[PDB]
Amino acid sequence: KKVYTTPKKIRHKHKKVKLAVLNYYKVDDEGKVAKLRKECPNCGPGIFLANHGDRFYCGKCHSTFATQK
């Protein structure tokens, strides 16, 4: 068989990068539990849309939300 040449690139996948987990919430003056980031209109509170620079995609819907806010 032919001599293996290979033209570079030994790529990999997204290994997740585990950040903080519960950073999309705030708890203040004893008992209160206030929400950070807009909750998903497709499926209610628990799943909250990712807020970027006019980019509003989901996780359970995986991608299906794009409208401006």
Binding site: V21, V33, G44, G46
Partner: protein, 122 residues
């Protein structure tokens, strides 16, 4: 004690495991709560961050509170279903479960839930 020595909770957990209903972790618990999917709440005791615990408490308060605290998280992990099988008499890989929220309930009646009810409705 002839009656319940914290092991009603254990039984409940087991039942949940059998019928697939244990929301394990903080995020999962939150998810269970905010939609109204999960009912029961097991709170962390050995919380060196404490913030997480507070959050959990808040969540419990927010919708419905049949809250319980038990004894740490490692114990819970050992009991309910964490650490690979290992023989008949424990000796598993000792791992903590952090937070537990119960869906489905599991089995019917028993001394499983009466205590919980008492704790809740006052």
């Amino acid at each position: 004690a002839e009656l319940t020595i914290e092991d009603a909770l254990k039984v409940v957990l087991r039942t949940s495991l059998v019928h697939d209903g244990l929301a394990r972790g903080l995020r999962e618990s939150a998810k269970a709560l905010t939609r109204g999917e999960g009912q029961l709440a097991v709170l962390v005791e050995s919380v060196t961050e404490e913030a997480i615990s507070k959050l959990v408490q808040g969540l419990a308060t927010e919708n419905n509170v049949p809250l319980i605290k038990v004894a740490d998280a490692k114990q819970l992990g050992e009991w309910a279903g964490l650490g690979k099988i290992d023989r008949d008499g424990n000796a598993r890989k000792v791992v903590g479960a952090s937070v537990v929220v119960v869906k489905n309930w599991g089995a019917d009646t028993q001394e499983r839930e009466i205590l919980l009810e008492h704790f809740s409705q006052q």
